[model samples]
Target: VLSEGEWQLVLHVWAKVEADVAGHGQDILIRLFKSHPETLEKFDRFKHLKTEAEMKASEDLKKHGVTVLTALGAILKKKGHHEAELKPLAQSHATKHKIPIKYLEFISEAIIHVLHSRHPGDFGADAQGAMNKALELFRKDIAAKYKELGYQG
Candidate 1:
């Protein structure tokens, strides 16, 4: 969980890139797939795409990326409840989809890379620290959900 002020900082950082949430979100997936091909395999909707160009031009990818980022903003809006907020997501992905916590880290890295590369000024040291902490907490509880579901690795 993040402090109120830190949450505010994160919101501000996110706001600066609000105009291009779809682009950034889509790029996050692209970066993730490019950096870790295995993670791309997890997304059946996009796993078929062979190249970054195909991914970038994918309407399905764009729609899904926007949906994911919109959910992230909604999650961040609720301060100090990230764990509870993420439980349903964990249950959905962990048990049924068999998505492990490592893939979440892959997305986190992609998020950081996208924000840092696109909006350096807004996503500065303070925002980075806060976001990292929040993401760590989120990932930690996601691991808890995985454990509860008897998921290993």
Candidate 2:
């Protein structure tokens, strides 16, 4: 279990990233680099340099990025555009990369590190607002997608 400070940092990072991506497109990479220079080196595998053109070159990366961003956006904005996109994208990426679904924990931890550095102070209400918005969007989208396949969520 994480300490309160650790949890705060983790939530703050998730909220900040989700808020940025919701406001921008997946192009939120710009803010990520600006916010955490070290993350560029640390998460080099996830960075997309030619944001527009290269989405096709790495289909798995592109798809997963879209899935994550969209699900987050849906939660923050209460919209479901990216909600249906996450599952298949996640599955494909996991299969292609030999990553388990549990690998999201690593990504989450890296994000927490970034946030801890960026907002060493309390995460504040903005973080809460951003997370509430993003999470709701994610839930609605996932529920709808599951319904489409005649499954329960």
Candidate 3:
């Protein structure tokens, strides 16, 4: 559970980042794909994009990034109580895309890394811890849905 201060930290940082959702989302995806090349295979659209410049220029990548960040914003708006909102996403990834739950860890890492890079001094240890917990909750819900669907991978 996040304290009131922690929630403020999450919201404060997100407010600054979400202001440029397009750029922020693009950066997160670039970081994730570059850091974990295997993650690109999960996205049929992104698999062929190859370079970061190509990905940044792709409308599909921008749209997908916006959609992902928007969903995350929605969950955070509910103060981490809206795990149900992610069920369909989890189901789609598990049943349709066959994405592994482990990838969520990679995404989480990318998010934290991007957050720190974007915020710099504002995102201190406490903020990092809060983000970590919040993301853990998010991952936990997705993992549960993945298991419920009996996805072997």
Candidate 4:
């Protein structure tokens, strides 16, 4: 399992990525064309994963990194069905794989790395600003999750 602090960071990063990609434009398209040409053809692959086509259709390299970072931010920040989202995921994992909640931290970290690899580039100030806004939403979601679990955040 991850420490509370680590999870918080994970959530923050996810939120940042989501926001960044949502607003990215030509830069994203350029990068996609350069790094992963197949991405253009396989754009549908991410449809179920949660992303805006606006972020993925970019022909810009810089935007591609921004889009990826934004996506990472969203997943980490998004709330599951309930506070129980992770609980069920944890329970099922425990039952099926004998893993524990303590590993949630590791799982989240791995996800973050995957996002980085999936979307490579240094984000600019604009991307960071978008990520910051997304993090704010994450804070709200975290509070809501805690409340759903009958805890006072």
Best by lDDT: 3
Model 3 lDDT, residue 2, Cα: 80
The backbone clash count of each candidate, in order, is: 0, 7, 0, 27
Q: Global CA lDDT of candidate 3, please?
A: 0.85
lDDT (Cα atoms) of all candidates against the true structure: 0.84, 0.45, 0.85, 0.41
Assess the local accuracy of residue 11 in candidate 3 as a C-alpha lDDT between 0 and 100: 81
Model 3 RMSD to the real structure? 1.5
Expressed as tens digits, the lDDT of each residue in 51-150 for candidate 4 is 3454444345344456444443344444332343344433444454443232333323333334455444433334334434444433344444445554
What TM-score, over all chains together, does every model reach?
Answer: 0.92, 0.35, 0.92, 0.28
Q: In candidate 3, which residue ranges exceed 4 Å CA deviation?
A: none
Clashing pairs in 1: none
TM-score of 4: 0.28
lDDT of 1 by residue, 80-133 (tens): 576666878889888877787888998999998899998898888999988887
Task: Give all candidate RMSDs, comma-separated.
Answer: 1.5, 10.1, 1.5, 12.2
**Prediction 3 TM-score vs. true:** 0.92
Of 1 and 2, the candidate ahead on TM-score is 1
- Sort by lDDT, top down from the best: 3, 1, 2, 4
lDDT for model 1: 0.84
